[model samples]
Target: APTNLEQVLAAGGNTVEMLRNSQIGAYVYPVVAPEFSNWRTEQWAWRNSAVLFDQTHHMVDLYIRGKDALKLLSDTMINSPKGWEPNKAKQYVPVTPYGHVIGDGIIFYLAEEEFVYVGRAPAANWLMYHAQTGGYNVDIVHDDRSPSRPMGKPVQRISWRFQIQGPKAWDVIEKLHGGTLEKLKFFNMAEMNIAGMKIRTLRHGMAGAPGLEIWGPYETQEKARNAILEAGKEFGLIPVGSRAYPSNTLESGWIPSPLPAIYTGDKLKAYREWLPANSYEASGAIGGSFVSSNIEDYYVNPYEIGYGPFVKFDHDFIGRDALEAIDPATQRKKVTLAWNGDDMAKIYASLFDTEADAHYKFFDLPLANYANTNADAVLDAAGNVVGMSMFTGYSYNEKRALSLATIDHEIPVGTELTVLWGEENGGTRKTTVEPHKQMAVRAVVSPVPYSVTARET
Candidate 1:
């Protein structure tokens, strides 16, 4: 049996086929209820009122502490570290030596030589690997994500993470703080009182509304959560369930899933060997219409996914030279695809047609993604593949199905394109996918941060 990702890949034959057929099923937002009141109302609360997003589970947290910690981060991330200091956080992004994006997360610098990374498993895995093998003097501690199917087992973590977001988020926050809370610059760290306990905060927001990402000891979770909910009553705040939580990125323009671009690089072979066969990079499934025999076809660079501004050349780092050589003007640009309402209606309407051979792929309400990494094909008028739609879902606030995608740089917003909505040849064997026909859904290219308020903010 394969022991590591390298052996798993070698034994599985075709990487794309192996992933497409994996029985892993849909990515689970573990432990959270699928809905509280309902996904629609929960989603609407974020835009119209306020939302408390329980973010303690579903993401891995990695702590790196030592004198070498700063150097470790400076050596790996593309973001410049010139002015980075304690009480600040950065959207940490790392890429393969070839310049293709590996993964991204928010890394918080807590104090001198103390930092914690909070985000998906891929980036955590990447950071851990480097800290282990790069001859750095950092001590590491990893808190894995809660099991996808805990099946009633108790799950615990080092800290509790939550986000209060939406238009009235600040109102709810201030009410809980017992006074006005300063709205610091985005990603800045501070503290606020919650139920008599001092809770740390990261300045955050959603859709132009001021908010904060708060965390504290796991033991304090219930107290803080309850206090916030109680105080938020006047602001019309509601707890956002897992189902509606992931879709918020559709309006905020953050692509949560990008295939870690490490599978094929020779320099990455050792890292792959170190990864367990059961690791996310090995067992994760990919479901969508875009299929290619070469696994690299699915890889995307930071420039293509709206991280171009973070790539700086002030210091030496992995992939810096490759990134420097690439022309940002020629790379694909990120945009939100405002899916045509008429086509979406037609897709839903197909479920009732008993006479039809098959229905279009199931578009789950609020969030439609069916795999760990989604890569639906976006086509131009001439039927040429022009883009890859990365993250997708329906937003009740916009009354339109929307997808975050990266398309040809020259393609202007408002250009109508066709999104191939189902896998070719009757779909892959992923459990979330049923044998179905594809839909040429018409979608118009729109600016990312799709919400008008999100863009202006």
Candidate 2:
């Protein structure tokens, strides 16, 4: 599925897989099959929960021992580093010259002179270029994204990940894995041996839970997966597909990196002219797709991508002008939407009552990606196209139909809007946005939901 796996690994690169349709090309985390097709990208997160994924292909690791390491890294990242010690970790988003996100990942300052950049994408060359450009005194050594390389021949570098999460996740992890990680705080790392195999234990909260990732040599991975799968059963630990992981990441409003937006224009500033200045990465966390767009208006910046608290204008960084010069008066906001499931169910009941099948994908995955239609019929709201209905089956997590839609800037949480489900091409389904006074709608704007603990906690 990946074009060049070995080449990506040998160059101190991060090897990752992606959804082939290319919608989520921005993320460096590889999408494993059987799992990738299980849910929509954003549906992986449901409540504050636990899920185990095989993340050996994300292509990331540590860059240590260069004087330039500090200066170079400081200059390239959004979150500045503090005194680094072993087992310490922090989150950051690396941006391009235009201030568009390069990628979002976790950085562990393992020592005053060493650091580990985790959850990073496969295209790590950009990170190297920035280090070299900054003229730092450091050695950048990339390692395998997996721990399977520790053992000899039988232990190939290709590996798997066993993520134990949720409030009670640690309780289960300790029982099955048997390690000294009970005291590991958030974003901390440690080493332990299980079943005679040395394993890497990372106390990182990537999935919005009290997350812990357990990794080790090839043989150990099998044991770890089996152990977690069984150990976390009562705790709701699921063997998740890559398709749903992005949803959880977005609910936290953290977009993954896939380089900057591919712009064909001569001036990056031109892209800046379209920014709303005060927008967010919608609801939850967002990202994992490569940035490329005529959709510049929708391309979120560091400030807009749910990191409003992190932006510091005082210090200079790339895209400083456009970011600083943004019009504060304009507010671009992202909102969450949930279609009335009860109303949707009614439409399906009609099909059961008659011979017609209603509409295709009506009760299935989604009409299309992003947002689709709603109940109010395509609005002539003051004679302008205000918005479209967005609907998707959220990784089976929310277990409800969900989508994010952008509308007039004046829209409020309680303001009720309509949705219309129409026919495909020239089908006989007839365009129906709303049919009954009570419910002929297949979709509508209710309210946006997200993992607010990050913001609230």
Candidate 1, residue 50: the lDDT equals: 89
> Please, what's the RMSD in Å of model 1?
2.4
In order of appearance, the predictions have TM-scores of 0.98, 0.61
Q: Single out the weakest 10-residue window by summed lDDT for candidate 2.
A: 279-288
Q: Please write out the lDDT profile of model 1 over residues 1-457, one tens digit for every residue.
A: 8999999998999999999899999998989888889999998999899889999998999989998999999999999999899999999999889999999999999999999999999989989998999999999999999988998999999999999998999988888888989999999999998889889999998777899999998999999989989999898999999999988899889999999988898989998999999999999999899989999999999999999999989988999888989999999999999888899999999998989999999998888999999999999989999999988899988888999999999987778898999888888889999888999999888887884222110
lDDT of 2: 0.46
TM-score of 2: 0.61
Best-performing candidate as measured by TM-score: 1
lDDT computed for candidate 1: 0.92
